[PDB]
């Protein structure tokens, strides 16, 4: 039950795996038994779901024994489980996609506070561990705020997010 | 709930195709001059 993390805008590879090496059938159904992708001979056939124009596959690795699934421009509404059906198994993976950013676009002054907004899928409890070049290793829950935003605090602070022991790095836009 | 003599289907020839016995594109020679016809019988249907 491997679990992977996203960044709400980047790519990801949820790869199945087999051993025959003969370009065999497979599919990628979500948690609602709805098709998304799947080999049909040597062609491709996107499923009638809400991931029409984003789904794709590496059509050159189907012969080696790997059937990845590249989804571009990830969105919050995609966090869910996925199932391979390579030959007879039920190889399953979980995906969790969220975004942590700021609200003040550019207008910021020295001596004010900094606030972060993290949009995790409902029913999730990520941990926000800020890491900064100044050493302010601020630790807290999903929502974290900084009471000091000075000139020395310039640069993108690295508030990583940890969930199930897996850590994903972020960046914060600071304008002063 | 379909209708109420001829159903027309537009068709466009191609010259760059994808092979069906593997993976990879392919190209063919230019098309023929004209007067191309085909009469066919339909028997089955895959869904």
């Amino acid at each position: 039950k491997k679990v992977v993390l996203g960044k709400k805008g980047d790519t990801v590879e949820l790869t199945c795996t087999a051993s025959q090496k003969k370009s065999i059938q497979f599919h990628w159904k979500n948690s609602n038994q709805i098709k998304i992708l799947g080999n049909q001979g040597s062609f491709l056939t996107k499923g009638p779901s809400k991931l029409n124009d984003r789904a794709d596959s590496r059509r050159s690795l189907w012969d080696q024994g790997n059937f990845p699934l590249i989804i571009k421009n990830l969105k919050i509404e995609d966090s869910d489980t996925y199932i391979c059906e390579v030959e007879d198994q039920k190889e399953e993976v979980q995906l969790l996609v969220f975004g942590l950013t700021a609200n003040s676009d550019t207008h910021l002054l020295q001596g004010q506070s900094l606030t972060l907004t993290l949009e995790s899928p409902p029913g999730s409890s990520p941990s926000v561990q800020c890491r900064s070049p100044r050493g302010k290793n601020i630790q807290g829950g999903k929502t974290l705020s900084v009471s000091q935003l000075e000139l020395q605090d310039s640069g993108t602070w690295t508030c990583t997010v940890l969930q199930n022991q897996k850590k994903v790095e972020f960046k914060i836009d600071i304008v002063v | 709930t379909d209708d109420y003599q001829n159903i027309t289907l537009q068709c466009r020839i191609k010259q760059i195709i994808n092979m069906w016995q593997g993976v990879g594109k392919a190209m063919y020679a230019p098309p023929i001059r004209g007067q191309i016809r085909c009469s066919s019988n339909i028997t089955g249907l895959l869904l």
């Epitope: 124009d53 571009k72 | 594109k25």
Partner: antibody
Framework: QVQLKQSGTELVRPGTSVKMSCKAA????????IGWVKQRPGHGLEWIGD????????LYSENFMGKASLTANTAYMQLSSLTSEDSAIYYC???????????????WGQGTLVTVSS | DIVLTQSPASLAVSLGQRATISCKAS??????????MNWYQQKPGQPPKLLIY???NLESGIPARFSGSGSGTDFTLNIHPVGEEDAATYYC?????????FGGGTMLEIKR
Amino acid sequence: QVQLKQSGTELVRPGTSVKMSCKAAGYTFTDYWIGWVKQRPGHGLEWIGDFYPGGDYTLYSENFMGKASLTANTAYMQLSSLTSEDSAIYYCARGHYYGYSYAWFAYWGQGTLVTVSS
Amino acid sequence: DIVLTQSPASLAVSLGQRATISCKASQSVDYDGDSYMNWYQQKPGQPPKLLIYAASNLESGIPARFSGSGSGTDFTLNIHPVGEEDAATYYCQQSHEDPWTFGGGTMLEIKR
């Protein structure tokens, strides 16, 4: 049938970064490269870089290092350190992948004008 | 980088006359017997349209008034019957090896 559309004319200051958009049409766009083209009078027309959406691949020429940048059905351009020399017309083409991306492609786009003036 | 030279720089054509434009290449572009030439047409106020490809395989939509021939570093694009709408500039392009280079462009104006 593939059709390419580009945004309106742009007039920008020099030395800044300029954003361009070339929207696709009702075609997959996922297995096709996209070449970006610059045209200036008395020069013919020159290519900047070629960008693949099916993997976000990049192919550059030896004349646009540190100036051009490409991103990914709505592709975009990223030009940095703009100068008067870049006031010109810009186009986006279609293509393919799996080799011979632009070896035998077709179906060009319309174009847009960029004016570098103060 | 290959250097492509299109000739002549200027040319005059009378109506209903065969028109030929030549393209010279510094380095061979051949690979497995193929000619990797692309020919484009350009009219003022409109973008270039792909005219011919491969020098041996024609496009759609464009009439059969067109052809290309040659070998190696010497190619020729040929047009018949020259009409009124063909007053434009023509470009020869190599697709064999990067970087994608260009020629100087050949003008063509109808003579009546």
